[PDB]
Design a protein around this nucleic acid. Structure first.
Ligand SMILES: [K+]
Ligand SMILES: [Mg+2]
Ligand SMILES: [Mg+2]
Ligand SMILES: [Mg+2]
Ligand SMILES: [Mg+2]
Ligand SMILES: [Mg+2]
Ligand SMILES: [Mg+2]
Ligand SMILES: [Mg+2]
Ligand SMILES: [Mg+2]
Ligand SMILES: [Mg+2]
Ligand SMILES: [Mg+2]
Ligand SMILES: [Mg+2]
Ligand SMILES: [Mg+2]
Ligand SMILES: [Mg+2]
Ligand SMILES: [Mg+2]
Ligand SMILES: [Mg+2]
Ligand SMILES: [Mg+2]
Ligand SMILES: [Mg+2]
Ligand SMILES: [Mg+2]
Ligand SMILES: [Mg+2]
Ligand SMILES: [Mg+2]
Ligand SMILES: [Mg+2]
Ligand SMILES: [Mg+2]
Ligand SMILES: [Mg+2]
Ligand SMILES: [Mg+2]
Ligand SMILES: [Mg+2]
Ligand SMILES: [Mg+2]
Ligand SMILES: [Mg+2]
Ligand SMILES: [Mg+2]
Ligand SMILES: [Mg+2]
Ligand SMILES: [Mg+2]
Ligand SMILES: [Mg+2]
Ligand SMILES: [Mg+2]
Ligand SMILES: [Mg+2]
Ligand SMILES: [Mg+2]
Ligand SMILES: [Mg+2]
Ligand SMILES: [Mg+2]
Ligand SMILES: [Mg+2]
Ligand SMILES: [Mg+2]
Ligand SMILES: [Mg+2]
Ligand SMILES: [Mg+2]
Ligand SMILES: [Mg+2]
Ligand SMILES: [Mg+2]
Ligand SMILES: [Mg+2]
Ligand SMILES: [Mg+2]
Ligand SMILES: [Mg+2]
Ligand SMILES: [Mg+2]
Ligand SMILES: [Mg+2]
Ligand SMILES: [Mg+2]
Ligand SMILES: [Mg+2]
Ligand SMILES: [Mg+2]
Ligand SMILES: [Mg+2]
Ligand SMILES: [Mg+2]
Ligand SMILES: [Mg+2]
Ligand SMILES: [Mg+2]
Ligand SMILES: [Mg+2]
Ligand SMILES: [Mg+2]
Ligand SMILES: [Mg+2]
Ligand SMILES: [Mg+2]
Ligand SMILES: [Mg+2]
Ligand SMILES: [Mg+2]
Ligand SMILES: [Mg+2]
Ligand SMILES: [Mg+2]
Ligand SMILES: [Mg+2]
Ligand SMILES: [Mg+2]
Ligand SMILES: [Mg+2]
Ligand SMILES: [Mg+2]
Ligand SMILES: [Mg+2]
Ligand SMILES: [Mg+2]
Ligand SMILES: [Mg+2]
Ligand SMILES: [Mg+2]
Ligand SMILES: [Mg+2]
Ligand SMILES: [Mg+2]
Ligand SMILES: [Mg+2]
Ligand SMILES: [Mg+2]
Ligand SMILES: [Mg+2]
Ligand SMILES: [Mg+2]
Ligand SMILES: [Mg+2]
Ligand SMILES: [Mg+2]
Ligand SMILES: [Mg+2]
Ligand SMILES: [Mg+2]
Ligand SMILES: [Mg+2]
Ligand SMILES: [Mg+2]
Ligand SMILES: [Mg+2]
Ligand SMILES: [Mg+2]
Ligand SMILES: [Mg+2]
Ligand SMILES: [Mg+2]
Ligand SMILES: [Mg+2]
Ligand SMILES: [Mg+2]
Ligand SMILES: [Mg+2]
Ligand SMILES: [Mg+2]
Ligand SMILES: [Mg+2]
Ligand SMILES: [Mg+2]
Ligand SMILES: [Mg+2]
Ligand SMILES: [Mg+2]
Ligand SMILES: [Mg+2]
Ligand SMILES: [Mg+2]
Ligand SMILES: [Mg+2]
Ligand SMILES: [Mg+2]
Ligand SMILES: [Mg+2]
Ligand SMILES: [Mg+2]
Ligand SMILES: [Mg+2]
Ligand SMILES: [Mg+2]
Ligand SMILES: [Mg+2]
Ligand SMILES: [Mg+2]
Ligand SMILES: [Mg+2]
Ligand SMILES: [Mg+2]
Ligand SMILES: [Mg+2]
Ligand SMILES: [Mg+2]
Ligand SMILES: [Mg+2]
Ligand SMILES: [Mg+2]
Ligand SMILES: [Mg+2]
Ligand SMILES: [Mg+2]
Ligand SMILES: [Mg+2]
Ligand SMILES: [Mg+2]
Ligand SMILES: [Mg+2]
Ligand SMILES: [Mg+2]
Ligand SMILES: [Mg+2]
Ligand SMILES: [Mg+2]
Ligand SMILES: [Mg+2]
Ligand SMILES: [Mg+2]
Ligand SMILES: [Mg+2]
Ligand SMILES: [Mg+2]
Ligand SMILES: [Mg+2]
Ligand SMILES: [Mg+2]
Ligand SMILES: [Mg+2]
Ligand SMILES: [Mg+2]
Ligand SMILES: [Mg+2]
Ligand SMILES: [Mg+2]
Ligand SMILES: [Mg+2]
Ligand SMILES: [Mg+2]
Ligand SMILES: [Mg+2]
Ligand SMILES: [Zn+2]
Lengths: 53, 141, 110, 181, 83
RNA sequence: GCCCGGAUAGCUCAGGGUAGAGCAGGGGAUUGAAAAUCCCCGUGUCCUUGGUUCGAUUCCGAGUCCGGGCACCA
RNA sequence: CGCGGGGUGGAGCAGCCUGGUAGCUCGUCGGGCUCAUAACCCGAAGGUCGUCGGUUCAAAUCCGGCCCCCGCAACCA
RNA sequence: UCCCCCGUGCCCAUAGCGGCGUGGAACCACCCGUUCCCAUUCCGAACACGGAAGUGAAACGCGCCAGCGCCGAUGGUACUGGGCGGGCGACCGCCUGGGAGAGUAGGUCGGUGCGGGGGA
RNA sequence: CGCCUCCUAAAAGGUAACGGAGGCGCCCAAAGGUCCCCUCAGGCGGGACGGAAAUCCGCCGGAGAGCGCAAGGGUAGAAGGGGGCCUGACUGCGAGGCCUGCAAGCCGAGCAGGGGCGAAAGCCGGGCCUAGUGAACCGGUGGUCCCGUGUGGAAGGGCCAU
RNA sequence: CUGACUGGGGCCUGUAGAGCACUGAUAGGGCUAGGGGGCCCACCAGCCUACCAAACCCUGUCAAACUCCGAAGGGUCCCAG
């Protein structure tokens, strides 16, 4: 981790629950991360969006 | 004076000194040689002293072969210090030398010139020595 | 010194043999196509087929599918059903693919 | 395939003269042309522009074949060169497109070189291949001074199956390569 | 009593020992999951019924008996033979 | 994390109907000159995006960056 | 081989921190003004950064050895 | 059962480099084409497809050669587990069991399993 | 002063000194998954600008290159380079082990859910590997709807995640 | 009855010794890219080195952090005492 390499949560875009923790380099990757990930609540894969940790 | 031009590591752990010399036990170049009978760390200063002695006897003539090289860094702490605080600084270089090693050879000179020059050289050495002459045993190696 | 051909052939064969299956190995010449199902643990070919043995001719692809069915036909006879396909140095395409499609059509499991 | 004058000349004129010149026992022993590789090592377009375009568009007109970019293998400070910068165009001409370009290279291009006094005989590979260098791209008929923007030259590699320079020089002179000496 | 000042050494660090090496030798009975070799890179290679983890650790896939095999230029392999 | 603010020409700073002024720089007038002086001249998405209004520096939102302040620290 | 700081045009100082760009004042040289000099005004040149070695695509700049030069310390016995 | 070729293993250079000789009926390759499938950061070179006029030139297969590579004894030595001595030391020596590396002689231009095509 | 690599370390493991030398307190949205393809450094000869070194061609070349950064190990029969599609840098578990005073640290087949790549066999629970780290207490935030001091709520807690 | 220790058998190892194939060091000689040295040239060459200068070749060596090699031993498992 660092000031430019920030921790972040991934929020299921369909039930709004944060499901994963990870990082990115926000200078190299300014856009919000969007990744398909399995949501335990929706018991199915879903688009997940970065939010502030 | 002799010493390595470069080195991987500045300081070596101290030797052991067992066993007859590993190699360089036969006359390879000249006619007569000087043989170590006991082991020792021969310093660069000892070598340079045995060498000059043989030059000033050959009055710039003949050939001199030096077949030992001081590659082993020799370390000493500054005077009056206590033990510890790391290894002392390198103050000189020695050549490990074990019984049977031909350290010097000469040629281009009479048998009487070489025997005397090699005798003087051995007085510069911290060990007993022995003068040898190139035999067929040498040339068979 | 290896060529890309030999590097490729090792590359795919190494991966297949790790799975432990019987290996349906395919060799393709400019004229003929040959198949033999191989036990690498015993080092023994169990069953074979080829246009040269079956004395077939015509469309190389259409002939390739035929040896596939022919190899399968004899394979089911001796109990062999599951198998791993070995395209060796070949792309999974055309003649090799047709032979592969043929063997499945005849009942080999891969 | 199709009919190009140089190709038909290679079989009709140059192959029998080669056999009777060297005594080839096999018909595949006699030297063949293999490929023509054209190299514009630009480096002007390192970062100063993507002028690679206007220079590949002209390579595409000269050879009929779209060039491919070459990128810097290592980084070099003196060259102001970061690893991976697009620093050239190379195109491999084979078969009929090789003949058509070689045919025009001899018939119109090399004569259009000013102070031309023949190709260097010493530039043979040592192993039967040849290389030459051009300083202008408008030496070729498809390029006009109005269509140009900056003079760029090239390296031309002609590869043959001849094992020796001696065989290859006979192959290229018989085809019509004017050698200076 | 004069006491001469002393300098210091810039060294004196070493890392924990990692306990690497072979963990089950040829002829030993092992159970699926047993660790066989701790290693850096593929000093030994996984043979028959032996897996390899992300840190090159070799481990048995079946109950059975360990066997080693030196394949020359192909490398040293560890096998597990079924019982 | 929260409240308060700024970004406007190269530097400084003023600002629902304009894009401003000073200094830096350009020559020109001046002396012996260093200037002061006198003159004219340039140098902007007013940080970015939506939205307002007939209009956008303004007003709003939202983020970017840099200012201040507050509280905290297991 | 106790601990610090420093070495870069001719002199005295930036640049090193944060690797890519050598800068400021004087001095030096060519012109000008003066009867002449100084001052003053207009131009210009000169530094491969103590050294060897390493890292790096690239070292005055970062790291290790050596050379040189200033500063501090050396207490309880 | 034996010879040749094709495919696929195993031993992991006694199997390699180089020099030479040799093979196209079959098999393999190159080859003839680039319509079709598919393909080139450009290129039918590669990958791929459709073919069968030609050539074993390249590749490959098989042989012969010890120049290089590779293997390599026997004997002797170094060292050493255990047992004993010696020297102020640096270090040395004996008994018993084990025993290299280098080097010498020498060997090697592969050997073998399974299947398929062909042959006698 | 913690962590990693090498040596010391006496051919298992472990092994000390203010012993000999270095490194870490990050990084990567691909530098991750999978499928398909490709093979370096350097030597020599050849080629406009072009040099020791840019890009191009031939020959030789088993790895001396490369693998983000120290070192060691490993490695082209790829772990190195290129491309396509993608997010397994999964959720719920976990036989069996390595290591080890504790606590921690490490490797892990296989089952299920819902997926990625592939024709398939299969691979995928980040990264060739070994540093890139901090027990508990106290508090923040999202969720869960488990407790809610006569009762319904609420205040405040608990649990999961960070 | 599984123990210390011991017999046999398999696997693991990189020390002693040795070696120089890798990383470095290194003595003598030969052949030699960059020159100094320099009768000298810059009109464009050169040319000669009883000197330093990679690579290669021959002779000869050194290394805890070098290894093409490599023991005695040591460890561990099985069977037996
Ligand atoms: K006192
Ligand atoms: Mg990330
Ligand atoms: Mg749940
Ligand atoms: Mg965020
Ligand atoms: Mg000692
Ligand atoms: Mg030694
Ligand atoms: Mg002494
Ligand atoms: Mg000492
Ligand atoms: Mg000392
Ligand atoms: Mg000490
Ligand atoms: Mg000796
Ligand atoms: Mg004496
Ligand atoms: Mg005598
Ligand atoms: Mg010898
Ligand atoms: Mg048919
Ligand atoms: Mg077919
Ligand atoms: Mg195959
Ligand atoms: Mg003919
Ligand atoms: Mg065409
Ligand atoms: Mg020539
Ligand atoms: Mg023209
Ligand atoms: Mg050729
Ligand atoms: Mg005292
Ligand atoms: Mg005292
Ligand atoms: Mg006293
Ligand atoms: Mg220190
Ligand atoms: Mg320690
Ligand atoms: Mg430890
Ligand atoms: Mg330790
Ligand atoms: Mg350690
Ligand atoms: Mg082990
Ligand atoms: Mg794994
Ligand atoms: Mg065995
Ligand atoms: Mg087995
Ligand atoms: Mg100075
Ligand atoms: Mg100065
Ligand atoms: Mg500074
Ligand atoms: Mg800077
Ligand atoms: Mg200056
Ligand atoms: Mg002047
Ligand atoms: Mg007068
Ligand atoms: Mg004056
Ligand atoms: Mg100036
Ligand atoms: Mg320094
Ligand atoms: Mg610089
Ligand atoms: Mg006091
Ligand atoms: Mg029979
Ligand atoms: Mg074969
Ligand atoms: Mg065979
Ligand atoms: Mg030969
Ligand atoms: Mg023939
Ligand atoms: Mg042949
Ligand atoms: Mg034929
Ligand atoms: Mg014929
Ligand atoms: Mg078409
Ligand atoms: Mg041939
Ligand atoms: Mg031989
Ligand atoms: Mg051997
Ligand atoms: Mg031997
Ligand atoms: Mg023996
Ligand atoms: Mg002895
Ligand atoms: Mg003994
Ligand atoms: Mg011992
Ligand atoms: Mg013992
Ligand atoms: Mg003893
Ligand atoms: Mg005694
Ligand atoms: Mg004494
Ligand atoms: Mg003894
Ligand atoms: Mg003894
Ligand atoms: Mg004995
Ligand atoms: Mg004995
Ligand atoms: Mg031997
Ligand atoms: Mg003998
Ligand atoms: Mg012999
Ligand atoms: Mg021999
Ligand atoms: Mg023979
Ligand atoms: Mg041989
Ligand atoms: Mg034979
Ligand atoms: Mg064979
Ligand atoms: Mg077999
Ligand atoms: Mg057979
Ligand atoms: Mg038959
Ligand atoms: Mg037969
Ligand atoms: Mg502590
Ligand atoms: Mg720590
Ligand atoms: Mg150990
Ligand atoms: Mg170790
Ligand atoms: Mg243990
Ligand atoms: Mg203790
Ligand atoms: Mg250090
Ligand atoms: Mg440190
Ligand atoms: Mg992404
Ligand atoms: Mg990585
Ligand atoms: Mg990919
Ligand atoms: Mg050249
Ligand atoms: Mg060039
Ligand atoms: Mg690198
Ligand atoms: Mg680094
Ligand atoms: Mg490597
Ligand atoms: Mg890609
Ligand atoms: Mg998709
Ligand atoms: Mg998931
Ligand atoms: Mg467990
Ligand atoms: Mg534990
Ligand atoms: Mg850890
Ligand atoms: Mg599943
Ligand atoms: Mg699946
Ligand atoms: Mg599918
Ligand atoms: Mg599947
Ligand atoms: Mg799994
Ligand atoms: Mg990767
Ligand atoms: Mg507390
Ligand atoms: Mg709490
Ligand atoms: Mg909440
Ligand atoms: Mg409730
Ligand atoms: Mg209540
Ligand atoms: Mg109520
Ligand atoms: Mg209730
Ligand atoms: Mg709470
Ligand atoms: Mg709560
Ligand atoms: Mg018992
Ligand atoms: Mg026991
Ligand atoms: Mg024992
Ligand atoms: Mg030793
Ligand atoms: Mg060496
Ligand atoms: Mg040694
Ligand atoms: Mg050693
Ligand atoms: Mg050997
Ligand atoms: Mg031990
Ligand atoms: Mg034992
Ligand atoms: Mg044992
Ligand atoms: Mg028992
Ligand atoms: Zn959800």
């Amino acid at each position: 981790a660092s000031e430019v390499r920030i921790k972040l949560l991934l929020e299921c875009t369909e039930c709004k629950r944060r499901n994963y923790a990870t990082e990115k380099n926000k200078r190299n990757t300014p856009n919000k991360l969007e990744l398909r990930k399995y949501c335990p609540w929706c018991r199915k894969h879903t688009v997940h969006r970065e939010v502030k940790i | 004076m002799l010493m390595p031009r470069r080195m991987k590591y500045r300081k070596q752990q101290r030797g052991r000194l067992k066993g007859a010399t590993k190699g360089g036990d036969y006359v390879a170049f000249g006619d007569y040689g000087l043989v170590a009978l006991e082991p020792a760390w021969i310093t660069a200063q000892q070598i340079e002293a045995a060498r000059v002695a043989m030059v000033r006897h050959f009055r710039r003539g003949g050939k001199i072969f030096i077949r030992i090289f001081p590659d082993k860094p020799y370390t000493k702490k500054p005077l009056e210090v206590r033990m510890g605080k790391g290894k002392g600084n390198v103050e000189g270089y020695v050549a490990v030398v074990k019984p049977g090693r031909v350290m010097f050879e000469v040629a281009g000179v009479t048998e009487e010139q070489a025997m005397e020059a090699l005798r003087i050289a051995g007085h510069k050495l911290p060990i007993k020595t022995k003068i040898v002459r190139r035999d067929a045993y040498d040339e068979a190696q | 010194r290896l060529t890309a051909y030999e590097r490729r052939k090792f590359r795919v064969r190494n991966r297949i043999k790790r799975t432990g299956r019987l290996r349906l190995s395919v060799f393709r010449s400019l004229k003929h196509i040959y198949a033999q199902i191989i036990d690498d643990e015993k080092g023994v070919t169990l069953v074979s087929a080829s246009s040269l043995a079956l004395k077939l001719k015509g469309n190389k692809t259409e002939v390739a599918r035929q040896v596939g069915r022919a190899l399968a036909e004899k394979a089911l006879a001796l109990g062999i059903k599951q198998v791993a396909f070995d395209r060796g140095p070949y792309k999974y395409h055309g003649r090799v693919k047709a032979l592969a499609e043929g063997a499945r059509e005849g009942g080999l499991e891969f | 395939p199709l009919d190009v004058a140089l190709k038909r000349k290679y079989y009709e004129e140059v192959r029998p003269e080669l056999i009777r010149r060297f005594g080839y026992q096999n018909v595949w022993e006699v030297p063949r042309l293999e490929k023509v590789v054209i190299n514009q090592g630009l480096g002007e377009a390192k970062e100063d522009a993507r002028i690679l375009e206007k220079a590949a568009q002209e390579l595409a007109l000269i050879t009929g074949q779209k060039p491919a970019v070459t990128r810097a293998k290592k980084s070099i400070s003196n060259f102001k060169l970061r690893k991976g910068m697009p620093i050239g165009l190379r195109v491999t001409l084979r078969r009929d497109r090789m003949w058509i370009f070689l045919e025009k290279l001899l018939n119109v291009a090399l004569p259009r070189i000013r102070d031309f006094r023949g190709l260097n005989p010493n530039s043979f590979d040592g192993r039967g291949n040849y290389n030459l260098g051009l300083r202008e791209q408008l030496i070729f008929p498809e390029i006009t001074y109005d269509m140009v923007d900056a003079l760029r030259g090239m390296d031309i590699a002609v590869v043959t199956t001849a094992e020796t320079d001696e065989e290859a020089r006979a192959l290229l002179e018989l085809l019509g390569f004017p050698f200076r000496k | 009593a004069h006491k001469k000042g002393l300098g210091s050494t810039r060294n004196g660090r070493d890392s924990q020992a990692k306990r690497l090496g072979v963990k089950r030798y040829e002829g030993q009975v092992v159970r699926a999951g047993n660790i066989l070799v701790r290693q850096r890179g593929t000093r030994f290679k996984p043979g028959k019924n032996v897996g390899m983890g992300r840190d090159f650790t070799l481990f048995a896939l079946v109950d059975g008996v360990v066997e080693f095999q030196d394949r020359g230029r192909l490398g040293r392999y560890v096998h597990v033979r079924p019982l």
